[PDB]
Amino acid sequence: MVSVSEIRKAQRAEGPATILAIGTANPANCVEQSTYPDFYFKITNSEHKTELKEKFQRMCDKSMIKRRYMYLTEEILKENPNVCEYMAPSLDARQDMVVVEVPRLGKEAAVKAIKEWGQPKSKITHLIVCTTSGVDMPGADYQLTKLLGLRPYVKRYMMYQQGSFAGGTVLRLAKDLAENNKGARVLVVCSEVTAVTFRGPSDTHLDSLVGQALFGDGAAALIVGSDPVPEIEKPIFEMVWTAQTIAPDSEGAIDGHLREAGLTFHLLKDVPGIVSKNITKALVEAFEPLGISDYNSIFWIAHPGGPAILDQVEQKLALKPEKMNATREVLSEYGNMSSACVLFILDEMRKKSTQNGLKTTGEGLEWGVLFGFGPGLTIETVVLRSVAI
Amino acid sequence: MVSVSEIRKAQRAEGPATILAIGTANPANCVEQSTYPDFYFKITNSEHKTELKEKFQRMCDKSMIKRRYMYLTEEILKENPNVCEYMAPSLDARQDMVVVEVPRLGKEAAVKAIKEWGQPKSKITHLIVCTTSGVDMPGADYQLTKLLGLRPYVKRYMMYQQGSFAGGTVLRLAKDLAENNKGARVLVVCSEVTAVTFRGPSDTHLDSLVGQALFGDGAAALIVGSDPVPEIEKPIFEMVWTAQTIAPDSEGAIDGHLREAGLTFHLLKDVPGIVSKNITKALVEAFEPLGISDYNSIFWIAHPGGPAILDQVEQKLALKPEKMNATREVLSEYGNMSSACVLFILDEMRKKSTQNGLKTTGEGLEWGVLFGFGPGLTIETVVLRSVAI
Ligand SMILES: CCCCCC(=O)SCCNC(=O)CCNC(=O)[C@H](O)C(C)(C)COP(=O)(O)OP(=O)(O)OC[C@H]1O[C@@H](n2cnc3c(N)ncnc32)[C@H](O)[C@@H]1OP(=O)(O)O
Ligand SMILES: CCCCCC(=O)SCCNC(=O)CCNC(=O)[C@H](O)C(C)(C)COP(=O)(O)OP(=O)(O)OC[C@H]1O[C@@H](n2cnc3c(N)ncnc32)[C@H](O)[C@@H]1OP(=O)(O)O
C-alpha cells in the first residue's frame, strides 16, 4: 500500500538552504577595552599582582578589540567573590546567571531575525540553539520555545558545550534540515555569555589570561530555509557545501572543562600557527571542485579567535588586507563571542555590501567561505554563494 | 558559471534513511534489583532511615527491573563519600568518571555495530554522539573519533545534556543527515552513565529517590544510511517520518540541573498520566497520513521511563499486552538507560523477530512507532518501516 518513495519525494525540499534573515543582540553593559586591565585587576582584587597587569595590558592593547558587551557588571561581580577568584567553587552561581541569560539574549536576537523575515513565527518548523555557557534540562531550546511562543511541535536541536567553531556547525546542521524537508524554516540561535568563564588572573595560567582579554557576549539568530517564496522572502546567502575536520598535531590546542569552579579554558599549543598551517587544505577541499584557486576572489568570514589567527592566515595565503575587514570590524566592536561571531560577521558583511551599493551581499563577489575554529583543533568550513544586490 | 542546482542534485541521496546495524555495550558491574535497597542504603550510610528505606524497597520491587549495569562500584563509592551524600560538592569527581567512561562504553557499542555493518570504518561520514552524563571540550564525539580511528574529517554532532527522549532525537537527526547526503553513512552512539546522578536518599526529595531505583548504564550504536548497497549492506528498519512535541500542562514534569553536587533531577508533575494523555495525539499525527488507526497493527518501541508509563499507555490505548514485550524486556534486563534505551529495544525486537522466524524485523508487521519521553515534557516520535526477514 503506502509507498515510501512517494512519501520521500513529497517530503523533501528542492534547492539550496538559504539564509533569509539575521538578527543580533548583546547585553547592555559595554566594557571599554582600553580601561579593562584596570577594571579587571581591581575587581579581581589583584592590583598588587603588578607584573601580571603589565602582561594583560599588552594582551588587551594587542587584542584589536575596542569594546566588549558583558552580562557581568561590577555590581554582579561584587556579589560574587568566588567568580572573581582564579579557581574557586562557583559553578552554581554561574549557572544561575547563564541558564537565564542565554535564552534571554537569544530571544532578543531571534525577535529581530523574525521581524526581518516577515513571516508568521508559527511557520518556524525547526529550532537550533547553540551555546558554550551553561547546560540545563529542559535546555535553552525549550526556554526559547516558551519565550518566543513557537509552536510546541517545533523540532529542536540543542547544541550544548560546543565551542568557538560551532557558528560553522549550526550552519552545517540547518543546511541539511532545510534541504531535506519541504517547507522547513529553521530558526538558528547562537548565544554566548562568558559568565561561565570569567575568572581572576593567575601568573601560572597565562592561557586563561588571554581568554579574559578576548571573549565577549552576544547572540545571533538566523532564519534558514530552502525554496524561498520570491518577492515575499528575501535570500541573503546560499549554503552550498560544508565540512568539519580535526587538524593534525593539535591535540590539546584548545580545551575547556566544566567543573565546580566553572569553565576553565586551557591553550596548550600554537592555535594561530595550527589554523594557518591547515587552512590551505580546507580551501582546496572546498573550492577545488568549484574550479576556484584564487582565494582573493571569494568573500571571507573567519572566526576571530584572536587577531593573530587572522594575521597569520592573511600572511600565509597572501590575502589582501581588505579580505578580513568584516571579520576584523566584528572583532573590534564585540570581541570574540565564540559561536555567534561568524554570524555577526555575516550580518556585517551583508549590511555593508547593501548599504554601499555593491552588486552582491558577499562584497560584490559570487562565492564565499565561512570558517569556524575551536576545540579539537576543529575547523568547520561552509561554502556560500551571495545573492544579487 | 557553476550550477548550484546541478551540485544540489548530485549531492543528495535518494531513498529513506535506513538502519543497517545496531550494537550495544554495558558496564561489567551487574547490580541486582532485589537486593539493591540494602546495598544502596548501606553504601550511603542511610540504614537508620527505616521508613524511607521501606519506601525504596517498594519502588524497586514495583520497578519491574531485574538488574542494571553500573560503572559505579562499591570500591568507587567508597573513595567518593561526597558522591554518596544526597547533596555534596562532587561534580569534579563525577565528571572525571564520565568524561572517560561515556566514550569508553560508546566505543564498545560502536565496534560491535561497525563489525555487523561489515564496511570499512573510513566510509563513516557523519557521527552523532549523545549523552546526558558529563560535558567536556573537545567532546565525547572527538574522543570517539580518536578512539575508533574514524577519518579526522568525519562530520560530528555532539548532543550533550539531552535527557531521556534523545533516543528519538538522534534518529530524527540521522534521518536528515543520511537522506540529504549521497553516500553518507552515519555512526550513531548514545551512551549513558549514571555516575553524575547517583546520590544518597533524602525523605524531602522522594522524586530523586525514584530515579535511583530506575536509572541504569548502557550504550547503543547504529549505522544509518540511505540507498543501501543491495546484498552488501543489510537494512534492519527504515525511518519514514519524525516529530518532536512538548505536552501541554507539563512544565517542570522532568527537570535536571547540573550543579557542583552533580546532576539532580526533580519530578514536579505526573509523568505517566502526561504521557498517556498525550500519546494518542502523537499517534494520530504520525499515522493518520498513513491511513492507519489501529494501534495494535503496528510494532511498538516506547522509552520505558518507568513501568507505570508503559502500563498507563497500554491501558489508554487498549494495546494488547504483547505490544510492549521488547520494551519491557529491555526494562527488565537493563533498567532505564535514558537515551540508549529505545535503541536497545530496536535491537531486541529485531533480534527476537529474526531468531523466531517472523516475516519482518518489526515482529512480522510492516509499520512501527518509536517514542522517546523526557524533559519538556518532551515526546519524540519516529515512524518506522520494518524489513522483510
Ligand atoms: C569557546 C571555545 C573555543 C576556543 C577557541 C577560539 O575562540 S582562546 C581561542 C583562540 N585565541 C587564540 O588562540 C589567541 C591567539 N593570540 C592572539 O590573538 C594574540 O596572540 C594576542 C591578541 C593575544 C596578542 O597579540 P600579538 O600576538 O600580536 O602580540 P604579542 O605576541 O606581543 O602578545 C603580547 C603577550 O604575548 C602574550 N601571549 C598571548 N598569547 C600567548 C600565547 N599563546 N603564548 C604565549 N604568550 C602569549 C604574552 O604575555 C605576550 O608577550 P609579553 O609577555 O612580551 O607581553
Ligand atoms: C534522562 C532524562 C529524562 C527523564 C525522563 C525519563 O526517563 S525518571 C522519569 C521517568 N519515570 C517516571 O517519570 C515515573 C515512573 N514511575 C513509575 O514507574 C512507578 O510509580 C514506580 C516504579 C516508581 C512505582 O511503581 P508503581 O506505581 O507501580 O507502585 P506504587 O504506587 O506503589 O509505588 C511506590 C511508591 O512510589 C513513590 N512514588 C513514585 N512516584 C511517585 C509520584 N509521582 N507521586 C508520589 N509518589 C510516588 C511512592 O513511595 C509510592 O507510595 P509509597 O509506598 O508510600 O508506597
Strand partners, A371: A302, A381
Question: Which residues approach ligand 1 with their CB closer than 6 A?
Answer: A 55, 58-59, 62-63, 132, 163-164, 206, 210-211, 254, 256, 267, 271-272, 305-309, 336, 338, 373-375
* Amino acid identity, position B109: A
Q: Which residues in B lie closer than 8 A to residue A154 (C-beta atoms)? A: 244
Answer for the pair B133, B97: CB distance below 8 angstroms, yes or no.
Answer: no
Q: How far apart are the first and last CA of chain B?
A: 49
Distance B253 CA to ligand 2 centre (A): 13
* Residue A282 backbone dihedrals phi, psi, to 5 degrees: -60, -50
Sign of CA dihedral A205, A208, A212, A214: positive
- CB distance A162–B162 less than 8 Å? no
In the beta sheet, which residues pair with residue A246?
A378
Do B198 and B63 fall within a single domain? yes
Which technique? X-ray
CATH code: domain of residue A384: 3.40.47.10
Residue B219 burial (10 A CB sphere; 0-12, 13-18, 19+): buried
- Pairwise CA distance, residues A257 & A116, whole Å: 37
The CA angle A167-A169-A173, to the nearest 5 degrees, is 120
* Amino acid at residue number A321: P
Residue A116 structural domain: 2-235
Taking CA atoms, A195 is separated from A10, A92, A199, B321, in Å, by 46, 12, 9, 52
The count of domains in chain B is 2
CA distances from B337 to B24, B110, B214, B215, B263 (A): 12, 17, 8, 6, 15
What amino acid occupies position B85? E
Residue of A nearest to B255 (CA): A137
| Among candidate residues A104, A155, A153, the one with its CA nearest the CA of residue A131 | A104
**Cβ within 8 Å, pair B291-A2:** yes
CB-CB contact of A169 with A342 (8 Å)? no
Give the domain-ending residue among B183, B207, B235.
B235
Task: Check A142 against B12: CB less than 8 A apart.
Answer: no
What is the C-alpha separation between B105 and B140, in angstroms, rounded? 11
Residue position matching grid coordinates 551540485:
B7
**A137 contacts B163? CB cut-off 8 A:** yes
Nearest CA in chain A to B89: A260
The DSSP result for B216-238, as a single string, is --EEEEEEEESS--TTTS---EE
What residue has cell string 562557583?
A90
Are A38 and A157 contained in the same domain? yes
Same domain, A193 and A316: no
Query: Parallel, antiparallel, or unpaired for β B126-131 and B185-192?
Result: parallel
Which helix (H) or strand (E) element contains residue B383?
strand B378-386
Beta-carbon neighbour count of residue A81 at 10 Å?
15
In one-letter notation, the amino acid at residue A146 is K
Any atom of ligand 2 within 6 Å of the Cβ of B262: no
Determine whether the shortest distance from the Cβ of B132 to ligand 2 is under 6 A: yes
Burial class (CB in 10 A: 0-12, 13-18, 19+), A224: buried
Distance from CA of B83 to the nearest CA of A (A): 14
Q: Following DSSP, what letter does each residue of A194-229 receive, concatenated?
A: GGGT-----TT-HHHHHHHHHB--EEEEEEEESSPP
Give the residue from A8, A247, A221, A9 showing the smallest Cα distance to A108: A221
B224 and B85 in a common domain: yes
Amino acid A236 reads I
Contact predicate A43/A351, CB 8 Å:
no
Strand-pair category, B237-246 with B378-386: antiparallel
Residues B300 and B229 in one domain: no
Is residue B65 within 8 A of residue B35, CB to CB? The reply is: no
Closest CA to B304 of B335, B263, B348, B262: B335
Q: How far apart are CA B14 and CA A177, in angstroms?
A: 16
Ligand 1 centre distance from Cα of residue A253 (Å):
13
What is the number of other CB atoms lying within 10 angstroms of the CB of residue B124? Answer: 24
3-class SS shares of chain B: helix, strand, coil, % to 5? 40, 25, 35
Burial class (CB in 10 A: 0-12, 13-18, 19+), B334: buried
Nearest ligand 1 atom to alpha carbon A336: 7
Q: B104 with B218: CB under 8 angstroms?
A: no
**A227 and A258 both lie in a single domain:** no
Q: Which residue has the cell 531513498?
A: B15
**Under 8 Å between Cβ of B167 and B341:** yes
CA distances from B8 to A26, A125, B135 (A): 36, 22, 35
Which grid cell sits at B147? Answer: 578512539
Which one of A176, A245, A266, A292 would you mutate to disrupt binding with B, by most B Cβ within 10 Å of its Cβ?
A: A176
Contact A37, A60 (CB under 8 A): yes
Cell of B174: 540521522
Are the beta carbons of A375 and B244 separated by less than 8 Å?
no
Of A155, A149, A144, the C-alpha closest to A121 is A149
Residue B143 alpha carbon to ligand 1 centre in Å? 27
> At which of A235, A265, A297 does a domain end?
A235
CA distance A206 to A223: 39
- Last residue of some domain: B235, B253, B273? B235
Examine the domain organization and report whether A240 and A185 are in the same domain: no
Residues 6 or more apart whose CB falls under 8 angstroms from that of B133 comprise: B98, B102, B192, B193, B194, B195, B196, B197, B263
Measure the CA–CA gap between A309 and A288, rounded to whole angstroms.
Answer: 23
Q: Which of B18, B180, B251 to mutate to test the interface with A (most CBs of A within 10 A)?
A: B180
**Helix, strand, or coil here: B327?**
helix
* Non-local CB neighbours of A344 within 8 Å, separated by 6+ positions: A24, A218, A220, A330, A334, A337
Question: From ligand 1's centre to the CA of A210, what distance in Å?
Answer: 6
Q: What is the DSSP letter of B261?
A: T
Q: Among candidates B231, B215, B171, which has minimal Cα distance to B69? A: B215
Which ranges of chain B would DSSP assign to H, the alpha helix?
A: 4-11, 36-43, 50-62, 74-78, 81-84, 91-117, 140-148, 166-179, 206-214, 271-287, 307-317, 325-334, 341-355
Same domain assignment for residues A249 and A322: yes
Residue B137 DSSP class? B
CA B325/CA B337 separation, integer angstroms? 17
Measured between alpha carbons, how far is A146 from A219 in angstroms, rounded to an integer? 18
Q: How far apart are CA B176 and CA A142, in angstroms?
A: 21
Q: Is B42's C-beta closer than 6 angstroms to any atom of ligand 2? A: no
Cβ within 8 Å of residue A61, ≥6 positions away: none
User: Is A258 found in the same domain as A380?
Assistant: yes
Q: At what angle do helices A307-317 and A325-334 cross, to 10 degrees?
A: 170
| Chain CA centroid to CA B84, Å | 25
Element (H, E) at B240: strand B237-246
- E strand segments, chain A: 18-25, 30-32, 67-69, 126-131, 155-160, 185-192, 218-225, 237-246, 255-259, 262-266, 299-302, 367-374, 378-386
Residue B173 shares a structural domain with residue B259: no
Whether the CB-CB separation of A109 and A220 falls below 8 Å is answered with yes
- Number of cross-chain residue pairs from A and B with Cβ atoms under 8 Å apart: 175
Residues in contact with A146: Cβ distance below 8 Å, sequence separation at least 6, in sequence order: none
Using DSSP's 3-state secondary structure scheme, residue B111 falls into: helix
A152 closest CB neighbour out of B95, B245, B257: B245
End-to-end CA distance of chain A: 49
What was the resolution (in A) of this experimentally determined structure?
1.9
Question: Cβ contacts of residue A270 below 8 Å, gap of 6+?
Answer: A253
Mutate to test the interface with A, among B246, B377, B379 (most CBs of A within 10 A): B246
Q: Determine contact, residues A317/A279, Cβ cutoff 8 Å.
A: yes
Q: With beta carbons less than 8 A apart as the criterion, state whether B377 and B365 touch.
A: no
A153 contact residues in B (CB cutoff 8 A): 243-246, 285
Instruction: Give the three cell numbers for residue A5.
Output: 518513495
Question: Which ligand is closest to the CA of A216, given by its number?
Answer: 1
For residues A382 and A239, is the Cβ–Cβ distance under 8 A? yes
For B25, the 3-state DSSP assignment is strand
Pocket test residue of B58, B257, B344 for ligand 2, highest count of atoms within 8 A of CB: B58
- CB burial string A277-298: b at 16+ within 10 A, e below: bbbeebbeebbeebebeebeeb
Do A258 and A220 sit in the same domain of this protein? no
* Gap from CA of A199 to ligand 1 centroid (Å): 17
Binary contact (A260, B260; C-beta < 8 A): yes
Whether residues A315 and A199 share a domain: the answer is no
Among all residues of chain B, which has the CA nearest to that of A265? B137
- The residue of chain A with its CA nearest to that of B90 is A260
Q: Which three cell numbers stand for residue B115?
A: 563489525
- Can you tell me which atom of ligand 2 is nearest the CA of B336? 7
Q: How far is the C-alpha of A335 from the C-alpha of B288, rounded, in Å?
A: 51
